[PDB]
Amino acid sequence: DTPYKADLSRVHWAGSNSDVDIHLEIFEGDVDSGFMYNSFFRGNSSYVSVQDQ
Amino acid sequence: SDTPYKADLSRVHWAGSNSDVDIHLEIFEGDVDSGFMYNSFFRGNSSYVSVQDQ
Numbered sequence: 001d002t003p004y005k006a007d008l009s010r011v012h013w014a015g016s017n018s019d020v021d022i023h024l025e026i027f028e029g030d031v032d033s034g035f036m037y038n039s040f041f042r043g044n045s046s047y048v049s050v051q052d053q
Numbered sequence: 054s055d056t057p058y059k060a061d062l063s064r065v066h067w068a069g070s071n072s073d074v075d076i077h078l079e080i081f082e083g084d085v086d087s088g089f090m091y092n093s094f095f096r097g098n099s100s101y102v103s104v105q106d107q
Contacts, residue, residue: 026104 010018068074 024101024107026107028102 008018012021012023014020020053062072066075066077068076077081
């Protein structure tokens with residue numbers, strides 16, 4: 001009911017009447033990916049090295 | 054069950070020609086009560102991003 005409803009100036013709203021959204025997204029350092037995991041059975045075995053022989 | 058002086062009593066703050074109207078003064082101490090009190094609890098259990106003026 002405000003008297004100014006018919007004369008508003010909307011910045012990021014295009015078209016014949018200000019209905020279409022053309023705003024800009026805001027992004028930061030956020031990236032979602034898979035969860036982490038660490039080995040557990042590394043010490044439960046006998047070990048031998050033949051790397052260069 | 055009626056004392057001899059019933060019809061000739063003097064009663065203060067009992068107005069009227071027959072002394073049967075209540076014009077006393079209320080005693081106020083300043084007690085006012087309304088709805089109960091609540092505080093938020095989940096205001097630090099999520100992420101936050103600000104887009105004000107942008």
